[PDB]
Structure 1
Amino acid sequence: VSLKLQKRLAASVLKCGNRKVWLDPNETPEISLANSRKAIRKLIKDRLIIKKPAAMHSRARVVERKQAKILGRHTGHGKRKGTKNARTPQKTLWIIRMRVLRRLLLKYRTTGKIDKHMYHDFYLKVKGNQYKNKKALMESIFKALEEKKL
């Protein structure tokens, strides 16, 4: 006998594919009489039809690769296949820096460290690529504040 109908109906009832349907190989005559979805539901209850577990796929190798890359184990020149701008965009570096530096100047003016006149000049200096990072801007502000206070 052929259990093609039972495999198709069981996959619909169990909401899986035909590849996950397990029909009991010793109870073939019992399953053969299950020609309806209602009968298939009874067989599933009696464990004559079982949904196979999904194929195991682990991420252990990927996790250890990323942790090694965090320490820099595979970030060498022989492991880079994309250009410098492709790996780390040059535009997003600029966008991050302007948000970072404009945030700091905004905080200094609001708190009263710098007035609007000194804020305005530093805003244009920052825009003109004068400071590489946050620290370089802080020292220049403090250097200018001391010069003004003299």
Structure 2
Amino acid sequence: VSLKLQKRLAASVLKCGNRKVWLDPNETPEISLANSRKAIRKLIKDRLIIKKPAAMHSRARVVERKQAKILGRHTGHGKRKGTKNARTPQKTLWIIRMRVLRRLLLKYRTTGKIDKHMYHDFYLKVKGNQYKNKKALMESIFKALEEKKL
């Protein structure tokens, strides 16, 4: 007897695909008598039909790869396949640095470390690509404050 109907009905009740349905092979005459969804549900409750667990997929291998690449283990020249701009976009580095440097000058103006005329002059210097990073701007501001008092 073909158990195609029971396999299809069980998959709709178990809410799984036909590949996850397990019909017990030693009671085919018992299973083949269930020609309705009400009868299938009883067979599921009686452990005649069970749902196979999903095949295991481990992320352990990927986790170790990221751990090694954090320490720069595989980030060499021979493992780089894209262009320099592709891996680290140049435009987004400008947007990141502009936000960082313009945030610092906004913090100093409200704190009173620099005045509006000094803040304005450094703003156009920041936009003009004068300081590589935060430290260079802090050094320039520190140096410019000492010329002011002299």
TM-score normalised per structure 2: 1.00
Question: Offset of 1:71 from its aligned partner?
Answer: 0.3
Partner deviation per Cα, 1:84-140 (whole Å, 9 max, x = no partner):
000000000000000000000000000000000000010000000000000000000
SS in 2 for 1:22: strand
Separation of aligned partners in 2, 1:97 and 1:58: 39
Q: Report the identity percentage.
A: 100
Inter-partner Cα distance in structure 2 for 1:22 and 1:138: 69
Give 5+ residue unaligned stretches, structure 2: none
Partner residue of 1:8?
Answer: 8
**1:50 match: secondary structure:** strand
Q: What does residue 54 of structure 2 align with?
A: 54
Aligned-residue RMSD, C-alpha: 0.3
Q: 1:62, CA displacement in angstroms?
A: 0.1
Distance in 1 of aligned mates of 2:71 and 2:125: 36
Q: Which aligned pairs between 1:1-150 and structure 2 lie closer than 5 A?
A: 1-150=1-150
Alignment coverage as a number of residue pairs:
150
1:40 is displaced (CA, Å) by: 0.3
Secondary structure of the 2:25 match is coil
The secondary structure found in structure 2 opposite 1:27 is helix
**Aligned partner of residue 16 in structure 1, secondary structure:** coil
Tell me, in whole angstroms, the C-alpha distance in 1 between the residues paired with 2:33 and 2:102: 77
Measured against aligned partners, the alpha-carbon deviations of 1:56-103 in whole angstroms (never above 9, x if no partner) come to 000000000000000000000000000000000000000000000000
